Each structure stands twice: as C-alpha cells, then as structure tokens.
Design a protein around this ligand. Structure first.
Ligand SMILES: Cc1cc2nc[nH]c2cc1C
Ligand SMILES: Cc1cc2nc[nH]c2cc1C
Ligand SMILES: Cc1cc2nc[nH]c2cc1C
Ligand SMILES: Cc1cc2nc[nH]c2cc1C
Lengths: 269, 268
C-alpha cells in the first residue's frame, strides 16, 4: 500500500483468501470490514499517527484521548471472489468539532469498476472516563494537513442511507440469537472487542432462508456502548419491509442495556 | 505464491495485518493456522486439485471421498510481528494406506531464520457416511507425482512431540469455559466449522495469568468428531507440569468428545 500522489488519501490491494469467503465463494462483509480497518491503520502509520486503531497524536495521548467509531455504513455491489484482487482507497475529513469521518471506495483491480463503498463517523473520547468532548482547535489543526480541503464524499447523494436516524427495536423481536460471547480471537491488541465482531453478532439473527436466497447490499450500524470481554449479548432482528429490510438491536443479555442498533438491506439473488 | 523449482513444494509470503495480532503485537496462533490452511489451498490449486479444503481428485469426487484432518501439531519459536513478512513453505507426503501428511516451515523473510514449523495427519473419509476407508492404489498414484520421493520431514527428531499419544482428561477439570457456540464467521465455504475455531476453543480455558506471563510454544490437537453449526461446546484444561496443559473439547450436553490436545508454554 501507499499514499496517493497528493498525499491526501491511501491505496492498498488485497488478494481474497480461502478462509475469508462464505458459501457464495466471495468475501464476507466481515472480511471487507476487517480490510477497511486494516487500510485505515496503514494510512495512519504512513503519516505518523498511532497504529492501535485509535489514530491518535502525541497531544491526544498526553490527554488520554482516543477516536471511537460512532457509526459504520457499508454498501457492497459485488463481493470480491476468492483469489481476486480488490483495491481499497481511504481518506479522512473533519466534520467540525463533532468528530471526523473516514471514507472508503472498493474497486475491482482488473476492471477498475467500483464494487463497494463505506463511510464511518468517529468521535473523540477520554479513554478512562468514557466521556465525549468536542474536538479542540489544537487537535483539529494537527489533522487538517492530511485531509482534502474540499469536500470528498464516498456518499455524496442529497438524501442517502448513511445519514438516516435508526429507530429502537421494540419487543417482541421477530428473530433472535441469544447468549453470544466473544472469545480471545474477537479481541484486538488492546484487549477490546473488535468492531467487526458486532457486525457478525447483528447478522447472527438473520434467518437462514434470507441468507440462502438474498445477498447483503447495505448495513448501517450505530455503536452506543462497548461489550466487555466478560459480557453476554442478545442479537434481535425484525423485518421492516423484491428487497428485504431489517431493523437490528444488540443488547446485554442481563439488564438489556443497548450496545448497538442497525439496519440491513438484502436483494434477491 | 508459487511452486518451487522442482515442483514438489509451494512457497508464499504474507504481511501480518493489524487485526491478526494479539496483546504482544505479534500474530496469534489462530492467524498462523489460517495462513497454513491458505498456503495448503494454493498448493492444491497450483496442481489441479479441489480448492475447498478437501484437496480431492475427480476420482475421489465421484466416490464422494474427502481428506479430513486427524491431527494438527504446531511449534512456534517467534510469532511474526505486525507488518513483518513471513514466508511459508508447504509440502505433502503419503504415509501408506493410513493417510497423508502435510508439513510446513515458517521463516522470517528478512533474516531467513526458521521461526516455526507444523505437521498435520489427514485421513480419507466418505463425506456422507463419515466412514474412513483407507487409501486405494488408484488414488495414491494420482498424488505421488506431487510429493517428494525421499522422506522430507518438518519434524525429523526420532520420537518427537508430533507423534505422542494424547490421554483423555478426567473430571473434574482444573479450568473450564462452557457454552461455546460457533457463529457464521467460524464456518467455511462448505458451511462446516473451520478447523482453526477448535484451536481457539481449546485456548479459551487457559487462565488469563498464563496468557499474561507465558508465550505459547507448542500445540498438538487431535480431531475426533466435528462440531455442527447448532452444537454447543465445553472447553476443559488441566495443568500437567515451562507450563504444560492437557485439553478436552466435548459437546455441552451428552459429553461426546470432539477434540483432545496438549499445549506447552514458556515463561516470557
Ligand atoms: C454473516 C454474514 C456475512 C456476510 N457477508 C456477506 N453476506 C453475508 C451474509 C451473512 C449472513
Ligand atoms: C484520526 C485521523 C487519522 C488520519 N490518518 C490520516 N488522516 C487522518 C485524519 C484523522 C482525523
Ligand atoms: C487465544 C490465544 C492465541 C494465541 N496466539 C499466540 N499466543 C496465544 C495465546 C492465546 C490465549
Ligand atoms: C491431498 C493432497 C494435496 C496436494 N497438493 C499438493 N500435493 C498434494 C498431495 C496430497 C496428498
């Protein structure tokens, strides 16, 4: 991988592995999500930020501040097949004092066609107290020189799926998968549950018939609270709808504390 | 990746990814195991066998026969760090009618030093009845031209760790992790639980203090029965001692054994 000519974005190629594909012999959305975080990590390494998933500056480290994902939105047109080369371009943009946005474009290396796109909203949080705060000028200015000055959006559409408010699923859910627990492979280098694990937990409650007859086209996931290594999660899904649409909710098995909410859109195969 | 000059082994390089490392900032043994199966799959693709994890011939496909892992033995001296390039060489060898063996050597691309090694025993099974049928001459002859004729072993030492019989853990276990279930990411393209998932389930019952103060050096795992998508597993561990542990994976309900293994850990 490498930064592009203008140094304002980063590109990297990946060959899809045998264990990275599902029943369709194409990459799963969880493999895609892991590749997005990987290209994001290499972009931060290439410009001098931390490479632990938080992409911090020395000033942020002194204040015990980190970047945390608030929303992840992914839209896939064609999942790359086993052995195919996928090229991913990523860039960041400040959204004022609210937070920052990281965008991605996925392309088929051979045809040059756009096969997918993603966007993510990130907020600054103190690592210890878990309290959010609006981005300071001192921190904001350190990042501006690595972002495009003019707006560059993976999702430019006037009223697009990445900015819709997600409602809260009401009991009883139509479908559920109960008692989901992370194992050591779900933890990152910082011993926190990997963001991609929550995507897998959301999809655990989609019925098998949908997985067999449809392809996942869009997923939007909000991150409200973190699942600890010793927490147990319940995954809830209800149909909201040719195309099928679902409302999702992840909550702690015990008290019902919300950790995530999302929506998925599936198209008939 | 590519077959070597003599066409009797396959080599491939990998750059260790950020999500592939643990708290030591080096590749986990599960990332290593996935890279071993990946290089194994590319070796079969390069010579015309199936690329679904079973490495079958057209004759085996007509008879509904597949290769299944009976034993996996891995020894790591240095886990590759995030961003490092690891090179893996793999080869196969027939062990008569019993089955076949796949071996691997892991090297640091920059120093050329051997950082790990692995060996695995595979048996032929009818995919429908689950009955082991032992290798026929017709099938054996199809594979021989892709293997070295002289013995080439990743573990040559006479009577080494890869060939020791593993005993059955007796209740009560010293440690346990109960109610482990596979999710869709643990399934392969054939909707079967990936062999690497069982390695993770075995390690789930190692106490946190051991993980914090020791490094995993050796793991030997026997595969007796597979966990179905709707099965629930219990992971049991007892100290047998460096630290050494005896392991057992069994179905949560009736206690049917699916795997047994041993691990050896060295102080950091
Ligand atoms: C878990 C899961 C992952 C996927 N990746 C692409 N389509 C998918 C469908 C499901 C159900
Ligand atoms: C956190 C962050 C990391 C980055 N890496 C490259 N541009 C970036 C911009 C931001 C805001
Ligand atoms: C799960 C696990 C995976 C590892 N990989 C290397 N050391 C390890 C230790 C544990 C506990
Ligand atoms: C199954 C099998 C697959 C192989 N791929 C390359 N050599 C091989 C030898 C065997 C036995």
């Amino acid at each position: 991988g490498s930064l592009t000519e203008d140094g304002l974005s980063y590109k990297e190629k990946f060959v899809v592995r045998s264990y990275e594909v599902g029943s369709n012999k194409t990459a799963t959305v969880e493999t895609i999500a892991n590749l997005l975080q990987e290209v994001g990590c290499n972009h931060a390494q290439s410009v001098g930020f931390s490479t632990d998933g938080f992409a911090t500056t020395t000033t942020m480290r002194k204040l015990h501040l980190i970047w945390v994902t608030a929303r992840m939105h992914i839209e896939i047109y064609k999942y790359p097949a086993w052995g195919d080369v996928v090229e991913i371009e990523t860039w960041c943009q400040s959204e004022g004092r609210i937070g920052t946005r990281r965008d991605w474009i996925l392309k088929d290396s051979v045809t040059g066609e756009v096969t997918g796109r993603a966007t993510s909203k990130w907020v600054m949080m103190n690592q210890d107290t878990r309290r959010l705060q609006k981005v300071s000028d001192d921190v904001r200015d350190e990042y501006l020189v690595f972002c495009p000055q003019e707006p560059r959006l993976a999702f430019p559409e006037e009223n697009n799926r990445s900015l819709k408010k997600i409602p809260k699923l009401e009991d009883p859910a139509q479908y559920s998968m109960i008692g989901l627990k992370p194992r050591r492979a779900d933890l990152d280098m910082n011993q926190h549950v990997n963001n991609v694990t929550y995507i897998g937990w959301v999809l655990e409650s989609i019925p098998q018939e949908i997985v067999d007859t449809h392809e996942l086209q869009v997923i939007t996931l909000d991150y409200r609270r973190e699942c600890q290594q010793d927490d147990v999660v319940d995954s809830l899904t209800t149909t909201t709808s040719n195309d099928s649409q679902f409302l999702h909710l992840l909550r702690l098995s015990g008290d019902g504390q919300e950790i995530n909410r999302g929506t998925t859109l599936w198209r008939k195969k």
